[PDB]
Amino acid sequence: AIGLVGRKCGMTRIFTDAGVSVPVTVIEVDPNRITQIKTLETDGYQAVQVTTGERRESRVTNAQKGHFAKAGVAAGRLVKEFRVTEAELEGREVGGTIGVDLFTVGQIVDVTGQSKGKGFQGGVKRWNFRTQDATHGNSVSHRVLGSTGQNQTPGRVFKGKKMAGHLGDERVTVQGLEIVSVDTERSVLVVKGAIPGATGGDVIVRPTIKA
Amino acid sequence: MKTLSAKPAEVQHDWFVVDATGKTLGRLATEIARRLRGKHKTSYTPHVDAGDYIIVINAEQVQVTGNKALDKKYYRHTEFPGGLKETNFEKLVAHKPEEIFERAVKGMLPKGPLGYAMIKKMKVYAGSEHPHAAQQPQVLDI
Amino acid sequence: MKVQASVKKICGSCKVIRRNGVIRVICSAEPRHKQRQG
Amino acid sequence: SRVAKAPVTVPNGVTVTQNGRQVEVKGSKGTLSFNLHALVELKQEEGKLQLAPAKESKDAWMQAGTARAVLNNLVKGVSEGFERKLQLVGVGYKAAVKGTVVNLNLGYSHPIDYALPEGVTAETPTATEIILKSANKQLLGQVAAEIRAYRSPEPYKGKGVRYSDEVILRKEAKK
RNA sequence: AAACAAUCCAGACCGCCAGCUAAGGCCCCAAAAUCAUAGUUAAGUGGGAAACGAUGUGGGAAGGCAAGUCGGCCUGCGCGGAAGAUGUAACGGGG
RNA sequence: CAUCUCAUCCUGGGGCUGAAGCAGGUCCCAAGGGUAUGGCUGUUCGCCAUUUAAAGAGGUACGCGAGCUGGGUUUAGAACG
RNA sequence: UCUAAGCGGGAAGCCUACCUCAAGAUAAGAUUUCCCUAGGACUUUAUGUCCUCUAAAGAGCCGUUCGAGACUAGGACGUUG
Numbered sequence: 001a002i003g004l005v006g007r008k009c010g011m012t013r014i015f016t017d018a019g020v021s022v023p024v025t026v027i028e029v030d031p032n033r034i035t036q037i038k039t040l041e042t043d044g045y046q047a048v049q050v051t052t053g054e055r056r057e058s059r060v061t062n063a064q065k066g067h068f069a070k071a072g073v074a075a076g077r078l079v080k081e082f083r084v085t086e087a088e089l090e091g092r093e094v095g096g097t098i099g100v101d102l103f104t105v106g107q108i109v110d111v112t113g114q115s116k117g118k119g120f121q122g123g124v125k126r127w128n129f130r131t132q133d134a135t136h137g138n139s140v141s142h143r144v145l146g147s148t149g150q151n152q153t154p155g156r157v158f159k160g161k162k163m164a165g166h167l168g169d170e171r172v173t174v175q176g177l178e179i180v181s182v183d184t185e186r187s188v189l190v191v192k193g194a195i196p197g198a199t200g201g202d203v204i205v206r207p208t209i210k211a
Numbered sequence: 212m213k214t215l216s217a218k219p220a221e222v223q224h225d226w227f228v229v230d231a232t233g234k235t236l237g238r239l240a241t242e243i244a245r246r247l248r249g250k251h252k253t254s255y256t257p258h259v260d261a262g263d264y265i266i267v268i269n270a271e272q273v274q275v276t277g278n279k280a281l282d283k284k285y286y287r288h289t290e291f292p293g294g295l296k297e298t299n300f301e302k303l304v305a306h307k308p309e310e311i312f313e314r315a316v317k318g319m320l321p322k323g324p325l326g327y328a329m330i331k332k333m334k335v336y337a338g339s340e341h342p343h344a345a346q347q348p349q350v351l352d353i
Numbered sequence: 354m355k356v357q358a359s360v361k362k363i364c365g366s367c368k369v370i371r372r373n374g375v376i377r378v379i380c381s382a383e384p385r386h387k388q389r390q391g
Numbered sequence: 392s393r394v395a396k397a398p399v400t401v402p403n404g405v406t407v408t409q410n411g412r413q414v415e416v417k418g419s420k421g422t423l424s425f426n427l428h429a430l431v432e433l434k435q436e437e438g439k440l441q442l443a444p445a446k447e448s449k450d451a452w453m454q455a456g457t458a459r460a461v462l463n464n465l466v467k468g469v470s471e472g473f474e475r476k477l478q479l480v481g482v483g484y485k486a487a488v489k490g491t492v493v494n495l496n497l498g499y500s501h502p503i504d505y506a507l508p509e510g511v512t513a514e515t516p517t518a519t520e521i522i523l524k525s526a527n528k529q530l531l532g533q534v535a536a537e538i539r540a541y542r543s544p545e546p547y548k549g550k551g552v553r554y555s556d557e558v559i560l561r562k563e564a565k566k
Numbered sequence: 567a568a569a570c571a572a573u574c575c576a577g578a579c580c581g582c583c584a585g586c587u588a589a590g591g592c593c594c595c596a597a598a599a600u601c602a603u604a605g606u607u608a609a610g611u612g613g614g615a616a617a618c619g620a621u622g623u624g625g626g627a628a629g630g631c632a633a634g635u636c637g638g639c640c641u642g643c644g645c646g647g648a649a650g651a652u653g654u655a656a657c658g659g660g661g
Numbered sequence: 662c663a664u665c666u667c668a669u670c671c672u673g674g675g676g677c678u679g680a681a682g683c684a685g686g687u688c689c690c691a692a693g694g695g696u697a698u699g700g701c702u703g704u705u706c707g708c709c710a711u712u713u714a715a716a717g718a719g720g721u722a723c724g725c726g727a728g729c730u731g732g733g734u735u736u737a738g739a740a741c742g
Numbered sequence: 743u744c745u746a747a748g749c750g751g752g753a754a755g756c757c758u759a760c761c762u763c764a765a766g767a768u769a770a771g772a773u774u775u776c777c778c779u780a781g782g783a784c785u786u787u788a789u790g791u792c793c794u795c796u797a798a799a800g801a802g803c804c805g806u807u808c809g810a811g812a813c814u815a816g817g818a819c820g821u822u823g
């Protein structure tokens with residue numbers, strides 16, 4: 001299903017007439033420009049490759065210059081593919097635009113983004129590990145992992161053991177979000193809930209796959 | 212007079228295509244392994260690969276006897292703490308017949324660099340057509 | 354069903370059947386005479 | 392086998408062709424098909440099938456008996472089909488054969504729509520009654536059993552879907 | 567004999583790109599039979615196990631009743647009985 | 662901080678019932694997930710209080726002290742019988 | 743007679759399905775676009791050697807930095823900002 005590429009602009013609230021306050025995220029959607037269409041005879045799968053935003057000409061390589069010039073679009077700051085079906089490819093064509101009116105108020109969507117990076121983190125923050133007693137004779141180990149295995153059988157650490165490591169900065173999808181408003185003059189989506197990432201980060205909005 | 216080894220530079224690999232329709236799996240794999248190893252040549256050398264290329268077509272029509280289509284299990288371990296996975300002969304032959312032929316033949320070959328080089332020469336295809344017509348394979352009827 | 358190592362006719366209406374290599378006893382008179390060897 | 396070694400009677404009107412290992416029985420009310428086991432061959436005189444094993448083994452005699460019984464059913468049903476009767480017992484249990492579906496009310500929170508296959512036809516003379524019929528005896532039995540499976544007769548009062556030719560184990564709940 | 571002091575075959579003076587054999591083997595890993603003849607098993611039994619259970623299936627000696635049928639034995643090979651902890655894991659593997 | 666087994670505690674699917682219904686008893690299949698907080702005691706356990714859908718049984722050097730503790734037990738002091 | 747031939751139904755379990763990673767998948771896959779088109783000599787006569795001319799697409803160093811970060815890596819920009 002074809003989606004949009006926008007930018008997390010920030011969070012707000014929307015008051016309903018009945019007094020309910022709704023936490024919302026504003027996604028700014030520069031209208032996406034179709035750069036390529038992949039079909040079964042050429043690529044082995046059907047997809048719509050789209051670009052959005054703008055990139056100055058000195059940061060655009062010659063390869064990408066020619067790739068955007070083949071289509072009738074200007075270079076954007078990123079290029080993304082959406083895997084689609086036929087009959088979801090009727091009025092789509094290279095050099096076309098996919099705007100914010102692809103979504104309706106109340107439609108359920110999934111938002112994909114890059115979560116905030118927390119760097120190197122320990123078991124407590126990364127795996128919800130429990131701390132050991134702060135003061136009952138406890139030595140210099142309060143937030144440490146504890147045991148990492150067993151004795152001589154198996155005599156190793158198993159794969160997938162939860163240890164300290166880099167946390168966040170991953171691709172995350174939040175499903176089941178509702179479209180609170182579709183401002184086509186501001187080119188903005190307003191969705192209910194929280195979406196992954198920081199303000200200014202790239203987010204992909206798709207129709208919900210749960211259906 | 213001393214016994215000579217085949218030089219790798221003068222080994223002549225030949226291409227063959229065998230049809231697997233309605234053949235016993237193991238009884239075809241033994242002949243494939245013999246051809247791949249080069250055991251049918253008088254220049255046979257255990258440290259040299261002098262075998263032939265073998266194209267297997269219609270690989271998904273290979274047969275097992277008895278009740279093995281349902282009873283023969285194929286195992287994997289992902290090396291994760293509970294990650295032992297299991298499949299059937301009939302599920303795997305309708306999903307990956309090339310893995311069936313590769314597992315059958317790789318166990319009948321030597322286990323080492325030369326063995327991997329020998330297994331590289333078996334090309335397995337589920338359909339009736341293969342892409343190696345440039346190599347002009349001869350019909351090896353087993 | 355009774356899953357036993359010893360299965361046999363109980364009443365005169367119990368039939369001894371073999372199904373998929375399992376010896377079973379099915380009875381039309383008494384549903385409680387159903388047996389499977391195992 | 393005694394079931395085999397007895398020739399099936401073909402009434403006048405039904406044809407039975409034997410193209411290959413397949414066997415096609417055409418009649419006034421159907422076109423059924425059958426496969427012959429590799430251990431048994433077929434031949435008519437003019438209007439009588441005589442199934443006989445080849446190689447004369449015990450397996451072949453078993454398979455020949457099976458082929459004779461199935462072909463006798465095929466001829467019988469293609470000439471004049473089979474029919475089965477279901478009876479619904481219990482208050483509120485109703486059945487309506489509309490179009491090619493059976494709408495059943497069997498003490499549930501929703502009525503069951505059963506979709507008859509292309510071989511089987513259904514009818515309803517009375518609400519607590521279904522008469523199915525088809526050429527295929529196997530298909531008829533399958534449809535009847537699948538309908539009965541929705542609500543089988545219970546021992547304590549007999550309520551449910553039952554066969555007309557079915558004896559029900561009755562019980563009681565003396566304290 | 568997978569691996570395996572004490573099992574089986576065999577007692578190493580040194581050399582050889584010679585031959586015959588033992589135990590054990592001869593589809594492939596891996597040297598030699600996809601050898602031959604006649605049977606049995608369908609359980610991957612072979613390739614772990616008992617009391618006991620059973621119209622499995624092959625053979626033998628009888629017996630009763632008369633389109634053959636009944637149920638008693640003695641045996642060959644099978645079936646159930648048969649649940650464990652890192653990973654198939656009770657043919658070394660492929661098969 | 663775990664990981665496995667299944668001889669299953671809950672949840673899922675069935676047979677029988679001395680199964681009216683509700684609810685049970687018992688056997689079969691099933692290891693995906695889940696599977697208390699406290700008082701007492703060094704306790705494991707156990708008892709009790711109150712929950713829970715349930716508060717499973719085991720293996721892992723009776724898993725885990727070059728990860729923590731050191732209450733018990735098993736150094737040297739001291740006392741009672 | 744559910745099974746021998748043939749045809750079905752049937753579970754939180756299995757395979758998919760949902761999410762994330764993933765071509766070092768050495769079998770290293772695919773698509774789009776972009777760049778490089780000079781002369782000689784010497785023989786070991788061949789992805790041969792040396793000399794002259796060439797230095798592309800792009801990448802990096804470096805700098806201003808970051809909602810990215812142990813160092814890295816990654817993202818943005820460097821005056822036409």
Ligand SMILES: [Mg+2]
Pocket residue numbers: 139
């Ligand atoms: Mg200290």
Ligand SMILES: [Mg+2]
Pocket residue numbers: 138139140
């Ligand atoms: Mg401290």
Ligand SMILES: [Mg+2]
Pocket residue numbers: none
């Ligand atoms: Mg080890």
Ligand SMILES: [Mg+2]
Pocket residue numbers: none
């Ligand atoms: Mg050895």
Ligand SMILES: [Mg+2]
Pocket residue numbers: none
């Ligand atoms: Mg000899």
Ligand SMILES: [Mg+2]
Pocket residue numbers: none
């Ligand atoms: Mg050999």
Ligand SMILES: [Mg+2]
Pocket residue numbers: none
């Ligand atoms: Mg032979």
Ligand SMILES: [Mg+2]
Pocket residue numbers: none
């Ligand atoms: Mg169990």
Ligand SMILES: [Mg+2]
Pocket residue numbers: none
């Ligand atoms: Mg307690």
Ligand SMILES: [Mg+2]
Pocket residue numbers: none
């Ligand atoms: Mg311990």
Ligand SMILES: [Mg+2]
Pocket residue numbers: 731
């Ligand atoms: Mg102490």
Ligand SMILES: [Zn+2]
Pocket residue numbers: 363364365366367380381382383386
């Ligand atoms: Zn009985």
